[PDB]
Amino acid sequence: NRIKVAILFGGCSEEHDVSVKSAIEIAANINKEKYEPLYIGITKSGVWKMCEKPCAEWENENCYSAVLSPDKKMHGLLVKKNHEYEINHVDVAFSALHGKSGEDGSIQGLFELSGIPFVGCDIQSSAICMDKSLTYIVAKNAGIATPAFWVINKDDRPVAATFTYPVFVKPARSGSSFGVKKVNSADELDYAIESARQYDSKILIEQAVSGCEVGCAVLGNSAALVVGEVDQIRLQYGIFRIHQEVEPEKGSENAVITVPADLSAEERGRIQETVKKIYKTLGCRGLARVDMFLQDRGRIVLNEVNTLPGFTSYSRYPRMMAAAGISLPELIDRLIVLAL
Amino acid sequence: NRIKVAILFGGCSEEHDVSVKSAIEIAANINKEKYEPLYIGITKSGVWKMCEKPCAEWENENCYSAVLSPDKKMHGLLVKKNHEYEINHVDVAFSALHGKSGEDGSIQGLFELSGIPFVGCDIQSSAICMDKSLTYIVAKNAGIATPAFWVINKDDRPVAATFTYPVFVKPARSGSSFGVKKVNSADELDYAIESARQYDSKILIEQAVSGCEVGCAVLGNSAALVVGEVDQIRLQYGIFRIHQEVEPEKGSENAVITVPADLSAEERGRIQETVKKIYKTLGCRGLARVDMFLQDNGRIVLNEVNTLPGFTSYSRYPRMMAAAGISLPELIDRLIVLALK
Amino acid sequence: NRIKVAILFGGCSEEHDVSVKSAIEIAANINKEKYEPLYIGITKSGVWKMCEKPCAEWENENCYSAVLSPDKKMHGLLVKKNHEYEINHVDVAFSALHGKSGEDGSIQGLFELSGIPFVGCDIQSSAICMDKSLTYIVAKNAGIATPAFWVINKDDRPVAATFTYPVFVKPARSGSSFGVKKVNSADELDYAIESARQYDSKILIEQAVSGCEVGCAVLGNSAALVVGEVDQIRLQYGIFRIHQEVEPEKGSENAVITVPADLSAEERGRIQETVKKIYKTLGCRGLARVDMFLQDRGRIVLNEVNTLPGFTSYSRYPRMMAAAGISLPELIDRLIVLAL
Amino acid sequence: NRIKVAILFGGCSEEHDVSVKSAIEIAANINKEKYEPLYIGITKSGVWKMCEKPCAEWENENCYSAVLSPDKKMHGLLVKKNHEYEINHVDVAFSALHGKSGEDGSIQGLFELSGIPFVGCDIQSSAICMDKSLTYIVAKNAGIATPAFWVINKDDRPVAATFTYPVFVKPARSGSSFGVKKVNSADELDYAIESARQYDSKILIEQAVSGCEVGCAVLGNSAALVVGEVDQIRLQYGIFRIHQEVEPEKGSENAVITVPADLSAEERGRIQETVKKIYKTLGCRGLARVDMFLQDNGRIVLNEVNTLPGFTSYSRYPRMMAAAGISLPELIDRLIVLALK
Ligand SMILES: Nc1ncnc2c1ncn2[C@@H]1O[C@H](COP(=O)(O)OP(=O)(O)O)[C@@H](O)[C@H]1O
Ligand SMILES: Nc1ncnc2c1ncn2[C@@H]1O[C@H](COP(=O)(O)OP(=O)(O)O)[C@@H](O)[C@H]1O
Ligand SMILES: Nc1ncnc2c1ncn2[C@@H]1O[C@H](COP(=O)(O)OP(=O)(O)O)[C@@H](O)[C@H]1O
Ligand SMILES: Nc1ncnc2c1ncn2[C@@H]1O[C@H](COP(=O)(O)OP(=O)(O)O)[C@@H](O)[C@H]1O
Ligand SMILES: [Mg+2]
Ligand SMILES: [Mg+2]
Ligand SMILES: [Mg+2]
Ligand SMILES: [Mg+2]
Ligand SMILES: [Mg+2]
Ligand SMILES: [Mg+2]
Ligand SMILES: [Mg+2]
């Protein structure tokens, strides 16, 4: 008897497509002798459908109305396959949504109502990692260095001449680099601010952090954390934004990612231990990808924490995992077992 | 039409009983000329049902298997009638659940997915106001004083002699004083940790904060805030735990509450302004009740923020609004309108 | 029946005198209705004596040979009051030694053999906090920023022209500022190195950390940490070295200490939480004073951790404690109760 | 005179029995022309006694209530004879205790206080080599590869499925394989955590490291190091746990050890050089046995460092020295002389 895994993807969110790709690789690797996956696509306009498999043409006549119910006795989906909505049991739920709806505690809220065990972070930790400002606040309180930043509310009007350049401008709650800009001088502050506001009514302005990006993929609950190899992004210019590029699977035009990171084993361990505390400080479980800056002084600053990280074929986390000897199938399985 | 309002109540939560009470009031005051209320009760064990009305024994052979769906096109409910689930449209959602599932962003999570407009706080402010230690961290970052506290997680075994008594022990994520206790001596610490551990695997030890409790009912969305009259609780011993008492509608045994509070007009306005700053700093909307301590030194310390406050007939929030001239029919309407904004 | 508290002081150590003063204030505050203190002075040459009370003239005809025994069934002292060594029971041991012999795990080793419960840090955490290098190594591994430093072994010969000034030079294992120097330029590197070597055959050279000194007094075991108010040392020049000054009780000539620190409540909380992790990373218990640097950027660097901190009347820790509402007597009592 | 040497053995430690064995050998090889040995046994329960000699049943109505005192003028022992404690001078101390109290800097702490010269490592290197996780942290900082591991403290409850098997479970601070176990499947994890938890409130989960165990006996103080022949252990299953086996003097059931190891002269020298770097990086002196893993890739990984290695008749350390031409009478003498340096 296969464990019935609802795998949610798509979503009403600008990262919709990254999500569809995350889902296409999960589908292609989960072990189907042990798991019976139910694919729940969420369209961009927020419509829920059960389909056959995730793909770029996932929306099709064969799909049908299927939601996750909040009701604990149903513990499952309400599906319309014939002329009638029927209840189908789910053993466990693995959402692959990214960003809005998916990592911001929203889907976690339904999982919680349903009583259906699920993969990864709970509500409050998804809400804390999603709002970058909220994440710096909890991170500072635990004693984790972070960028200096200013929250720009909807009605605010920062005066540009007051900052020191460069700066980064960005939505408080997006991902995949939607709305992010390196800002080099004052007359571009506004344009950047308005762009970040296409994605959230509240945006942040960060001091630039120097150095390079070092990431750490983490797996587990509180008592025992498994980390993959540390990765490193070096940028020839601009910012990291692989999913915004044309043909991302072909390699980035401005960024080079090395794994393991080209750093001693002492430096890499250090980055991992830092990632573990960030993770514990935020109250994460299951998985998250902890992204950091490694300054030339060698000190580690938090960048952000991505709780439901990309699983695309050119994604950071599965890659960090495979390099530590955990391939995707085994990854998927341990995540599901940790949910159970 | 009238605006269809789904009113959720009960819950898989220890504040279940306070919630049914909260819902009873709301059902008795909402204006049915303007609104068509749809009552969904959730059992203590997570089962959703549409009933005619909130009451002490609301589950009846009348009550509907009925869930609010996360689907945007459905924009409403899946209701079982004739053994088949069908779609019923809803205009706005007003959750009267309290605590677990209700103030911790769980319900808000489903409301967000559904696209139905809903009353009250979003998910992150609900999560931050629900975990008391999260609220202190965020209020502190914004300049609000808070009690000193210690997070005690599930497997911790703190030595009692470490603390300076008295101390308050409590769950991180509960309400209505479930699991709360003033502990005056180390030898009582263990008892209180275990009792709190019934409502959360995580629990707080707090510095006793001196003074009296002054609360403030807040209404509005970002900026335009209305406040009620400040209320004020004096205790003869123990802690405020009115919902836990014998027949609370008849009054408290150890607590007296005054509204407006017996403080100068300038002190009251100052508390209302502190209340306001806490509200914005936490990113609340719709409503909340901001509870504080006024110390002798005149310093205002955050106690906690109750994002979906009780609406029972002896509750603090409706009573503060009412003292400011907004009685329940109206508050309800302001809340729904705010959800519709 | 009073709890019999052996209070050890003095020691074969350059901080001997600070220790005697620490002891004179403990004696003047411990509650004698609850505790029956046994004063064990250790001379500078390492001779053990039981005396009447700690004082600058503690060594006197009335004292007599008294050691702590390693034997668990004795669980006490072997005292020679008459013509014979007799065994006297001890319920608990509070050592007030500082530095060598006392905070370096040495006295903790005897406590451990004896089975007599004792105040504060165990062996490995005293050994780790004592050797500043050892402390930076464990601290880096946990992800705690520290100064950049070089271990100068006995046989090494650093070449001065290679450093960037200023630097601090210091014994790997002393305290009270014995052997410490701010070094401003290269031709003073040696003189400083030789001076630090009067106190340890291994010395360290640290990059200067900018900003000011913020300290945090911590009390407790792992599960629950009580911290006093944060303190701040600002220096008009030179280094902090109050116990090296003439007439220290009269106030320092170069340093001003504020408590609570003149910083927001957010900044102070942050320093406290950082101190808690440093403490947990090092595996401390009972008490320690965690000293940090607060950089103008606002980031917190470790300076050192002092496990058996000064209790003199002008000492940092009791002061941080009293300011948080815990006066010395209550302090002493909770430390002893935590040992028990 | 002969040099008076206090020889401590037994201990309040689970390696108590291995220690008495270690002491038996030493008493049988020390040169009594040069040295006058003074045997202090410590019971399993912490009681100190002077006896005629180390043996399986060394406690006798002959054995002395006798402690090594921390006092510098006494420079030796307080010995009970005629019901009165008296001072006996000692020249040098050689502890043959193993593990708890013996390799964790406890005994070294008393030796430091006493000013008696003593054999072996100081307090901090003993503490760092005793807590395996401490050793990995310090070796790693110095560039030595180490196993990946997880610290599991007393109240932790790790989910087993998290790990990749096989995994090694063990106490942080023990020896002789007490509490160690190769766990090949998650369902065996719990058993192994609990069994390790008998010897330490803190325990380690380690990545299985592949290859064979290659060890190295080190002799000397800072710099001038002598090393024995590299030894090498091949296992047919399970783990090396010779002291735990039936009648180990007769050999192991699952383990074969070869010395010199069956590796090129260049690989052996390289391991000895790695051994040397580990020794200095940890600040050891006197002696230690540095145990490593040689992987197929030829990489050397630290297993652990045994600061006071066993001296039984089937022990690794004496045997490595002996293969290099230094037999026990001599090693003992080199150790004492080093303590006298
Ligand atoms: N403050 C910063 N300092 C340096 N680079 C930054 C900063 N903020 C953003 N970036 C760059 O922009 C990229 C993405 O922004 P990020 O904060 O990670 O948002 P998202 O969740 O959309 O990835 C980072 O990977 C990094 O290259
Ligand atoms: N730290 C504190 N100092 C003083 N009184 C406290 C403190 N914490 C709780 N109390 C008392 O206990 C009551 C209930 O605790 P509270 O923190 O408001 O949690 P909840 O009301 O959500 O259950 C308060 O109303 C007050 O009377
Ligand atoms: N690296 C450093 N950067 C700035 N000041 C330093 C540094 N190291 C030492 N100091 C100064 O010297 C004082 C004492 O040195 P410290 O490392 O604290 O040794 P001790 O244990 O003797 O106090 C500090 O209080 C500080 O003023
Ligand atoms: N991580 C590891 N990888 C491979 N084998 C191990 C590992 N840890 C322990 N072992 C095996 O278990 C034995 C005992 O564990 P060890 O770490 O040497 O502790 P101790 O010997 O102090 O009791 C080793 O000799 C080796 O056979
Ligand atoms: Mg992101
Ligand atoms: Mg990013
Ligand atoms: Mg509450
Ligand atoms: Mg309350
Ligand atoms: Mg010091
Ligand atoms: Mg200092
Ligand atoms: Mg060992």
Ligand SMILES: [Mg+2]
């Ligand atoms: Mg071993």
